[PDB]
Design an enzyme around this catalytic site. Structure first.
Site, PDB file in Angstrom:
ATOM      1  N   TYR A 183      -9.666  12.012  -9.363  1.00 32.04           N
ATOM      2  CA  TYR A 183      -9.905  10.529  -8.753  1.00 32.04           C
ATOM      3  C   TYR A 183     -11.258  10.296  -9.010  1.00 32.04           C
ATOM      4  N   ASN A 203      -8.716  18.306  -3.641  1.00 31.78           N
ATOM      5  CA  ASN A 203      -9.213  17.359  -4.482  1.00 31.78           C
ATOM      6  C   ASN A 203     -10.255  16.328  -3.919  1.00 31.78           C
ATOM      7  N   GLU A 204      -9.745  15.586  -3.104  1.00 31.10           N
ATOM      8  CA  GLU A 204     -10.618  14.644  -2.465  1.00 31.10           C
ATOM      9  C   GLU A 204     -10.191  13.948  -0.926  1.00 31.10           C
ATOM     10  N   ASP A 250      -0.176  19.718 -10.970  1.00 32.40           N
ATOM     11  CA  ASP A 250      -1.039  19.761  -9.956  1.00 32.40           C
ATOM     12  C   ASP A 250      -0.516  19.464  -8.471  1.00 32.40           C
ATOM     13  N   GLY A 251       0.226  18.466  -8.537  1.00 32.47           N
ATOM     14  CA  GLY A 251       0.932  17.823  -7.442  1.00 32.47           C
ATOM     15  C   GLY A 251       1.435  18.964  -6.620  1.00 32.47           C
ATOM     16  N   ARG A 274     -19.507  -2.335   1.298  1.00 30.19           N
ATOM     17  CA  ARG A 274     -18.363  -3.296   1.558  1.00 30.19           C
ATOM     18  C   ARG A 274     -17.685  -3.343   0.228  1.00 30.19           C
ATOM     19  N   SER A 297     -12.137   9.329 -12.634  1.00 35.32           N
ATOM     20  CA  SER A 297     -11.740   7.793 -12.780  1.00 35.32           C
ATOM     21  C   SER A 297     -12.654   6.657 -12.056  1.00 35.32           C
ATOM     22  N   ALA A 351     -15.320  -0.076  -6.264  1.00 33.22           N
ATOM     23  CA  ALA A 351     -15.359  -1.803  -6.662  1.00 33.22           C
ATOM     24  C   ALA A 351     -16.171  -2.247  -5.192  1.00 33.22           C
TER      25      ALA A 351
HETATM   26  C1  LIG Z   1     -15.468  -7.367  -0.833  1.00 34.74           C
HETATM   27  C2  LIG Z   1     -14.133  -8.128  -0.124  1.00 34.74           C
HETATM   28  N1  LIG Z   1     -14.381  -9.909  -0.535  1.00 34.74           N
HETATM   29  C3  LIG Z   1     -15.536 -10.241  -0.113  1.00 34.74           C
HETATM   30  O1  LIG Z   1     -16.269  -9.946   0.736  1.00 34.74           O
HETATM   31  N2  LIG Z   1     -15.503 -11.521  -0.698  1.00 34.74           N
HETATM   32  C4  LIG Z   1     -16.591 -12.444  -0.375  1.00 34.74           C
HETATM   33  C5  LIG Z   1     -17.725 -12.658  -1.392  1.00 34.74           C
HETATM   34  O2  LIG Z   1     -17.457 -13.000  -2.254  1.00 34.74           O
HETATM   35  C6  LIG Z   1     -18.124 -14.130  -3.036  1.00 34.74           C
HETATM   36  N3  LIG Z   1     -17.502 -14.681  -3.864  1.00 34.74           N
HETATM   37  C7  LIG Z   1     -16.289 -15.384  -3.840  1.00 34.74           C
HETATM   38  C8  LIG Z   1     -15.481 -15.200  -2.787  1.00 34.74           C
HETATM   39  C9  LIG Z   1     -14.676 -15.030  -1.933  1.00 34.74           C
HETATM   40  C10 LIG Z   1     -13.678 -15.142  -0.713  1.00 34.74           C
HETATM   41  N4  LIG Z   1     -12.900 -13.730  -0.716  1.00 34.74           N
HETATM   42  C11 LIG Z   1     -12.757 -13.318   0.597  1.00 34.74           C
HETATM   43  C12 LIG Z   1     -11.847 -13.659  -1.582  1.00 34.74           C
HETATM   44  C13 LIG Z   1     -12.308 -13.062  -3.056  1.00 34.74           C
HETATM   45  O3  LIG Z   1     -12.989 -11.684  -2.742  1.00 34.74           O
HETATM   46  C14 LIG Z   1     -13.111 -11.187  -4.008  1.00 34.74           C
HETATM   47  N5  LIG Z   1     -13.181  -9.769  -3.919  1.00 34.74           N
HETATM   48  C15 LIG Z   1     -11.933  -8.826  -3.468  1.00 34.74           C
HETATM   49  N6  LIG Z   1     -12.189  -7.768  -3.229  1.00 34.74           N
HETATM   50  C16 LIG Z   1     -13.735  -7.495  -3.819  1.00 34.74           C
HETATM   51  C17 LIG Z   1     -14.359  -6.407  -4.234  1.00 34.74           C
HETATM   52  N7  LIG Z   1     -14.181  -5.185  -3.972  1.00 34.74           N
HETATM   53  N8  LIG Z   1     -15.534  -6.570  -4.714  1.00 34.74           N
HETATM   54  C18 LIG Z   1     -15.858  -7.836  -5.093  1.00 34.74           C
HETATM   55  N9  LIG Z   1     -15.428  -8.923  -4.849  1.00 34.74           N
HETATM   56  C19 LIG Z   1     -13.996  -8.871  -4.242  1.00 34.74           C
HETATM   57  C20 LIG Z   1     -12.007 -11.604  -4.966  1.00 34.74           C
HETATM   58  O4  LIG Z   1     -12.760 -12.340  -5.866  1.00 34.74           O
HETATM   59  C21 LIG Z   1     -11.371 -12.593  -4.030  1.00 34.74           C
HETATM   60  O5  LIG Z   1     -11.042 -13.971  -4.764  1.00 34.74           O
HETATM   61  N10 LIG Z   1     -15.700 -15.953  -5.057  1.00 34.74           N
HETATM   62  C22 LIG Z   1     -17.132 -15.818  -5.711  1.00 34.74           C
HETATM   63  C23 LIG Z   1     -17.355 -15.833  -7.200  1.00 34.74           C
HETATM   64  N11 LIG Z   1     -16.381 -16.699  -8.024  1.00 34.74           N
HETATM   65  N12 LIG Z   1     -18.543 -15.601  -7.883  1.00 34.74           N
HETATM   66  C24 LIG Z   1     -19.196 -14.924  -6.968  1.00 34.74           C
HETATM   67  N13 LIG Z   1     -18.933 -14.416  -5.500  1.00 34.74           N
HETATM   68  C25 LIG Z   1     -17.856 -14.807  -5.171  1.00 34.74           C
HETATM   69  C26 LIG Z   1     -18.420 -15.094  -1.561  1.00 34.74           C
HETATM   70  O6  LIG Z   1     -19.426 -15.831  -1.727  1.00 34.74           O
HETATM   71  C27 LIG Z   1     -18.918 -13.580  -0.712  1.00 34.74           C
HETATM   72  O7  LIG Z   1     -20.094 -13.002  -0.833  1.00 34.74           O
HETATM   73  C1  LIG Z   2      -3.231   7.905 -11.099  1.00 37.98           C
HETATM   74  C2  LIG Z   2      -2.294   8.255  -9.993  1.00 37.98           C
HETATM   75  N1  LIG Z   2      -2.464   9.822  -9.804  1.00 37.98           N
HETATM   76  C3  LIG Z   2      -1.815  10.630 -10.834  1.00 37.98           C
HETATM   77  O1  LIG Z   2      -1.317  10.221 -11.723  1.00 37.98           O
HETATM   78  N2  LIG Z   2      -2.226  12.077 -10.309  1.00 37.98           N
HETATM   79  C4  LIG Z   2      -1.683  12.938 -11.449  1.00 37.98           C
HETATM   80  C5  LIG Z   2      -2.616  13.433 -12.516  1.00 37.98           C
HETATM   81  O2  LIG Z   2      -3.566  13.929 -11.959  1.00 37.98           O
HETATM   82  C6  LIG Z   2      -3.980  15.308 -12.516  1.00 37.98           C
HETATM   83  N3  LIG Z   2      -4.758  16.047 -11.565  1.00 37.98           N
HETATM   84  C7  LIG Z   2      -4.650  16.404 -10.296  1.00 37.98           C
HETATM   85  C8  LIG Z   2      -3.513  15.723  -9.742  1.00 37.98           C
HETATM   86  C9  LIG Z   2      -2.687  15.351  -8.826  1.00 37.98           C
HETATM   87  C10 LIG Z   2      -1.762  15.040  -7.953  1.00 37.98           C
HETATM   88  N4  LIG Z   2      -1.569  13.549  -7.644  1.00 37.98           N
HETATM   89  C11 LIG Z   2      -0.293  13.024  -7.662  1.00 37.98           C
HETATM   90  C12 LIG Z   2      -2.511  13.260  -6.638  1.00 37.98           C
HETATM   91  C13 LIG Z   2      -4.002  13.081  -7.098  1.00 37.98           C
HETATM   92  O3  LIG Z   2      -4.135  12.029  -8.015  1.00 37.98           O
HETATM   93  C14 LIG Z   2      -5.480  11.745  -7.945  1.00 37.98           C
HETATM   94  N5  LIG Z   2      -5.480  10.243  -8.056  1.00 37.98           N
HETATM   95  C15 LIG Z   2      -5.154   9.196  -7.318  1.00 37.98           C
HETATM   96  N6  LIG Z   2      -5.438   7.998  -7.763  1.00 37.98           N
HETATM   97  C16 LIG Z   2      -6.137   8.124  -8.981  1.00 37.98           C
HETATM   98  C17 LIG Z   2      -6.527   7.266  -9.889  1.00 37.98           C
HETATM   99  N7  LIG Z   2      -6.244   5.893  -9.971  1.00 37.98           N
HETATM  100  N8  LIG Z   2      -7.183   7.947 -11.082  1.00 37.98           N
HETATM  101  C18 LIG Z   2      -7.100   9.157 -11.122  1.00 37.98           C
HETATM  102  N9  LIG Z   2      -6.508  10.093 -10.586  1.00 37.98           N
HETATM  103  C19 LIG Z   2      -6.303   9.566  -9.498  1.00 37.98           C
HETATM  104  C20 LIG Z   2      -6.118  12.256  -6.821  1.00 37.98           C
HETATM  105  O4  LIG Z   2      -6.987  13.098  -7.282  1.00 37.98           O
HETATM  106  C21 LIG Z   2      -4.960  12.964  -5.929  1.00 37.98           C
HETATM  107  O5  LIG Z   2      -5.420  13.994  -5.450  1.00 37.98           O
HETATM  108  N10 LIG Z   2      -5.659  17.120  -9.858  1.00 37.98           N
HETATM  109  C22 LIG Z   2      -6.505  17.198 -10.872  1.00 37.98           C
HETATM  110  C23 LIG Z   2      -7.788  17.789 -10.982  1.00 37.98           C
HETATM  111  N11 LIG Z   2      -8.531  18.202  -9.869  1.00 37.98           N
HETATM  112  N12 LIG Z   2      -8.468  17.859 -12.210  1.00 37.98           N
HETATM  113  C24 LIG Z   2      -7.859  17.060 -13.182  1.00 37.98           C
HETATM  114  N13 LIG Z   2      -6.733  16.322 -13.152  1.00 37.98           N
HETATM  115  C25 LIG Z   2      -6.176  16.645 -12.083  1.00 37.98           C
HETATM  116  C26 LIG Z   2      -2.615  15.986 -12.747  1.00 37.98           C
HETATM  117  O6  LIG Z   2      -2.672  16.836 -13.490  1.00 37.98           O
HETATM  118  C27 LIG Z   2      -2.082  14.537 -13.580  1.00 37.98           C
HETATM  119  O7  LIG Z   2      -2.324  14.433 -14.767  1.00 37.98           O
END
Ligand SMILES: CCNC(=O)NC[C@H]1O[C@@H](n2c(C#CCN(C)C[C@H]3O[C@@H](n4cnc5c(N)ncnc54)[C@H](O)[C@@H]3O)nc3c(N)ncnc32)[C@H](O)[C@@H]1O
Ligand SMILES: CCNC(=O)NC[C@H]1O[C@@H](n2c(C#CCN(C)C[C@H]3O[C@@H](n4cnc5c(N)ncnc54)[C@H](O)[C@@H]3O)nc3c(N)ncnc32)[C@H](O)[C@@H]1O
Ligand SMILES: CCNC(=O)NC[C@H]1O[C@@H](n2c(C#CCN(C)C[C@H]3O[C@@H](n4cnc5c(N)ncnc54)[C@H](O)[C@@H]3O)nc3c(N)ncnc32)[C@H](O)[C@@H]1O
Ligand SMILES: CCNC(=O)NC[C@H]1O[C@@H](n2c(C#CCN(C)C[C@H]3O[C@@H](n4cnc5c(N)ncnc54)[C@H](O)[C@@H]3O)nc3c(N)ncnc32)[C@H](O)[C@@H]1O
Lengths: 264, 264, 264, 264
Positions: free
Chosen positions: A163, A122-123, A45-46, A148, A166, A185
């Site tokens: 993607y 794809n996306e 697919d790539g 966020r 997943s 996330a």
């Molecule tokens: C969305 C980006 N992150 C943030 O906005 N964090 C800031 C928030 O996070 C709360 N926070 C923190 C922190 C803290 C300080 N961080 C800057 C670092 C921590 O960011 C966490 N992290 C990273 N990717 C994330 C993601 N995609 N989704 C969710 N989290 C993500 C990861 O655990 C890392 O260590 N620790 C706790 C805890 N143990 N239990 C509950 N809430 C907590 C805190 O009050 C504020 O409400």
């Molecule tokens: C885990 C890393 N990626 C791969 O291993 N992709 C390779 C796999 O992906 C299948 N694949 C592709 C592709 C393709 C070519 N990619 C290198 C690029 C594509 O990687 C996708 N992607 C990125 N982050 C991902 C993630 N964390 N989790 C899942 N996907 C993720 C994203 O959609 C991007 O465009 N297109 C399709 C489609 N439309 N329907 C079903 N399967 C398909 C293909 O056969 C091989 O089985």
């Protein structure tokens, strides 16, 4: 008619390509990679995605076909053992065309650095360039949520098995002209709130991402990832353009899904 | 024109209903609950769903309006404070109609017990009547998976914000003519395998559930749950019928979603 | 005893810090940021995490206290309005100590570049340095799965309400000496397979990540993200070290969770 | 010593049982199903769960062994081809015992109808007896959330690979003395709010479910489902009792998980 063949570039795909070129030479088939009307992708697919992007400016003049030399690729209709049958069927013109929808991404910049537009099969995904990812999500000018988290993914229908899947997204039949937004996330607590659920948008809806603090983003379109600086807006909409496949037999989408994820 | 008003039956909804009837009496509005052309529901979404099912045989002659006397109901466009404005606007005919898609469920029986058909505004779900739930899922006659788990949910677009959402489904704009199938706690191991992901189907696709051992099922359509015995098939498809809403102002679906799940 | 105070560095936190220093001057409290026995963090959880890492080499000699000047931080026990009460209670020594488990991450390199070890209070995550992330996951020397996807997150109990939660992990009471591994967007199809579910490991279990092709990884420990090149192994285990909090009143973990995610 | 053998009751399991009884007759092994010290289950995990419940009052005097005559059952250590080796090893006493934690469920009634207590090896679940399921969730007397949805599941560590897994729960090594609470389709909107995440509780924490309106519930314990009327409280805690397995070789839990869900 005019055709070209792209290859993943391993021995198996290169040899199949050369043998298909030889077969096509027995018909009124001109090899032409500038203005092909049929584009055959040999690989995975790539490889197919790369062929699509190589000809994204002539999508309304081209029908695509994919051969998978490894595991069944999703955009693949043929195994290598069927290449000779494919040459014959293509030569005679015995095929219908099916179209899948595409995704348009527009990136707008500040300091009058214009717009860039991208087409995705794809996306398109967006993440921060480092540091927290925070964007306002605006749907048809309606402020919908402040996201966020790690990032966002906007998928085409045929991308929903990639993607999008997943990330918890729904799988959508490609006859539906739509795009689907999934979260990566998201943080959710008393203070930060997102919808959580995947969102499916029809044609003509516009989803705009607007920076809140940091303006630098890593934007992916299929497997191409690019750093964009000083972004004012990322805009997603279903494209008016479509990709066309040459189809020679029935291989329904839902059977394709079954074969790829359930059993084959 | 002809109208009727249903009430949740608490004091607040009954009194609002009586006051709206009084207001309508100042216009050329005949109360008629046999053949209404406008159906006003005063209550919550349960009240609205019940009004829909009360008139499911005249859906092409009726425009529906919902007033929510509690929290914002999803099928509600009006708060009770706006009832007088609604009476006026309805009286003058100052409204556009919007349509949402519906879901058709067909239940086929053995021993020549015929078919039953049901229409859903939110969803139709299926569970076992006790004992394990196991069905073969057949999509346009293609055997897609054998599902073992708690049950399955097939949602309309406007239903995607209801049970579908709690099951991990995508939220779909109701301009999309589709249905969405979500899983309830599927078993997945080396031996049992399902797709996991929600599936979104266009109009004209048919999803058939076929029993494997036990033939008795609890089938829900909106909030009506019925035991069906000796089932041979449950068939889902997007209905040709639509529900029509009277709209007097802009309340976009995505704003409705924002107000219900993000903040209001 | 000896204490120090860290501040987020906004006006509100700096002023509170200066006022607490003044209050402590009315007691036998020496300000000492080299060998404090009490470390007070004024800010948010990021400020607290930074205080933890500033003193990670004296964790068995220090009791930590967090004051949140914004929204309730998870590691915070006090609002700013209670600082004077805290000064008094700390001065008199009227407090019990509670301990939470920590996570040890070991990164081993090739070409005899030794090992680096890190301690985490929230989590350690791993992603690729660009290009696909693929690792073999080895549990107590048992090859468990080959993970392909965006990355992996290994959380402490108190970290389970942080990134772990957004990734679908379980929230675990911190009296449980465990670590929890969650997936970031794993690919799952007929060919690629992971467990999907979060995994919870007891003390003394070792989870080793082993590169498959690319050997460069972005490894995060709390909010510090570092590029590691030529990695041979990443090893996770519950640390023998613990963080100690000074507690002056009951604020049970589950009430803390309620207040942060349900209502407050 | 004293032993007994339960059988799933198909030809294959019955014949294996009779052959093992014959083998045991060549040793000092008395068949005794009143007070066995070894209980051998021949069948699947359902057969094993039934053997556990048959002897739940003598759990501290019994070591359990499972043979799977179908696909690898999770509580099974032996394939039927190894029965003769098992007879020999059991006869000589060449085995260590391993213990897994259990779950205690207490159901309290109104109108002085006392308490019923149940022990679970996999899980205990609660659903409504029909009509909406709404309970207050109280953790160590702290009101934590009001749950509205399909039901709740409280799992033991060894149960985490069963219903718990299908509900999104974490898989927990059984050396951890804990129970895990997962949600079944909770409603979440501006008005209704639950934690969403699975919750993992240590020994001595008590989780109490308290009815809000309807007091009738369907309560399952392993595969036994019972209607309870006029319920005032359902209380979950890690039991003081444990199940003991006879182990003759290494079959680590994480390898068991790999073999059941990844590949075997
Ligand atoms: C969305 C980006 N992150 C943030 O906005 N964090 C800031 C928030 O996070 C709360 N926070 C923190 C922190 C803290 C300080 N961080 C800057 C670092 C921590 O960011 C966490 N992290 C990273 N990717 C994330 C993601 N995609 N989704 C969710 N989290 C993500 C990861 O655990 C890392 O260590 N620790 C706790 C805890 N143990 N239990 C509950 N809430 C907590 C805190 O009050 C504020 O409400
Ligand atoms: C885990 C890393 N990626 C791969 O291993 N992709 C390779 C796999 O992906 C299948 N694949 C592709 C592709 C393709 C070519 N990619 C290198 C690029 C594509 O990687 C996708 N992607 C990125 N982050 C991902 C993630 N964390 N989790 C899942 N996907 C993720 C994203 O959609 C991007 O465009 N297109 C399709 C489609 N439309 N329907 C079903 N399967 C398909 C293909 O056969 C091989 O089985
Ligand atoms: C938890 C039990 N159910 C409810 O409390 N429903 C009452 C809530 O549901 C909102 N509601 C309704 C309704 C309505 C009237 N129902 C009594 C019947 C509907 O209950 C849905 N359902 C059943 N099992 C569920 C579960 N485990 N989890 C989530 N839902 C579940 C299912 O879609 C069914 O048709 N329709 C919509 C809609 N289209 N979009 C957004 N919200 C909507 C409405 O405002 C109130 O906030
Ligand atoms: C789908 C219906 N249930 C089944 O087919 N169970 C039979 C399967 O379940 C495996 N099984 C059993 C069992 C066993 C015997 N059960 C008849 C009772 C158990 O069914 C579980 N359960 C109920 N609703 C479920 C749902 N919607 N989704 C997933 N499970 C569900 C629940 O934990 C209950 O106790 N115990 C374990 C274990 N501890 N770890 C791993 N696999 C295990 C066993 O080998 C067979 O592969």
């Amino acid at each position: 008619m005019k055709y070209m063949i792209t290859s993943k570039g391993d021995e198996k795909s290169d040899l199949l390509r050369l043998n298909m070129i030889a077969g096509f030479g027995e018909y009124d088939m001109e090899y032409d990679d500038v203005e092909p009307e049929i584009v055959i992708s040999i690989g995975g697919d790539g490889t197919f995605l790369s062929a699509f992007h190589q000809y994204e400016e002539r999508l309304d003049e081209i029908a695509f076909i994919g051969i998978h030399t490894g595991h069944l690729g999703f955009y693949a209709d043929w195994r290598p053992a069927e290449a000779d049958k494919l040459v014959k069927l293509l030569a005679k013109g015995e095929y219908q065309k099916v179209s899948y929808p595409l995704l348009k991404t527009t990136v707008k910049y500040g300091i009058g650095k214009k717009e860039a537009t991208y087409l995705a099969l794809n996306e398109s995904t967006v993440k921060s360039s480092g540091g927290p990812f925070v964007v306002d999500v605006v749907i048809n000018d309606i402020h919908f949520e402040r996201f966020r988290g790690d990032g966002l993914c906007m998928s085409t229908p045929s991308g929903t098995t990639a993607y999008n899947k997943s990330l918890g997204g729904a799988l959508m039949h490609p006859s539906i002209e739509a795009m689907q937004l999934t979260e990566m996330a998201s943080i959710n607590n008393r203070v930060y709130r997102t919808i959580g659920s995947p969102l499916v948008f029809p044609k003509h809806h516009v989803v705009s991402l607007q920076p809140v603090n940091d303006k630098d983003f890593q934007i992916s379109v299929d497997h191409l990832s690019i750093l964009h600086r000083d972004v004012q807006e990322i805009r997603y909409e279903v494209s008016a353009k479509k990709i066309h496949f040459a189809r020679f037999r029935s291989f329904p989408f839902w059977r394709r899904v079954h074969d790829s994820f359930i059993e084959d």
